[PDB]
Amino acid sequence: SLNIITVTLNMEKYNFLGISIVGQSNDGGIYIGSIMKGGAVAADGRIEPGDMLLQVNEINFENMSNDDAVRVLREIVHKPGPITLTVAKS
Ligand SMILES: Cc1ccc(S(=O)(=O)Nc2ccc(F)cc2C(=O)O)cc1C
């Protein structure tokens, strides 16, 4: 049963999300492997390890390689403005 949540993070006080992403669509997809204390995601508290990362700032992370996902996340985090993550709960 579908369990989708959208998390908009104010990145005024945070310099990184503090997430590690594992796996990719072979369909499966890209998962939150771990969440690092000190990051925006940990502070917000809603996203948990095992959540599937679907979308960041209107970019579809479905059918995206792990390498590509890391590079896109880096580009987004290195630019100003709030970051909107949409995940499927485990
Ligand atoms: C410790 C640290 C800090 C910042 C970054 S980032 O600016 O390149 N952004 C990310 C990129 C990929 C990713 F899976 C997570 C992040 C993040 O902001 O936590 C990456 C990492 C590994």
Side-chain angles (χ1 to χ4, degrees):
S1 61
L2 217 63
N3 195 6
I4 313 292
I5 69 154
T6 298
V7 170
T8 301
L9 301 181
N10 188 329
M11 301 297 295
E12 279 163 37
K13 168 156 96 260
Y14 298 96
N15 295 134
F16 78 127
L17 293 172
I19 64 172
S20 75
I21 60 164
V22 299
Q24 58 191 42
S25 47
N26 70 13
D27 266 36
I30 300 170
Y31 300 94
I32 310 294
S34 68
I35 301 175
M36 179 64 73
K37 187 184 175 178
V41 168
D44 173 88
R46 281 181 286 176
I47 299 178
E48 304 172 297
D51 289 357
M52 186 181 291
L53 188 57
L54 298 185
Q55 194 167 302
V56 185
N57 286 13
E58 301 194 74
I59 303 298
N60 199 180
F61 272 57
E62 302 169 352
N63 321 318
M64 188 178 288
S65 83
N66 192 280
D67 297 349
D68 283 353
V70 166
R71 284 196 280 276
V72 167
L73 278 177
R74 182 180 300 123
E75 290 295 335
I76 287 168
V77 167
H78 280 222
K79 286 173 179 174
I83 301 170
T84 301
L85 304 79
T86 302
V87 302
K89 302 298 292 178
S90 59

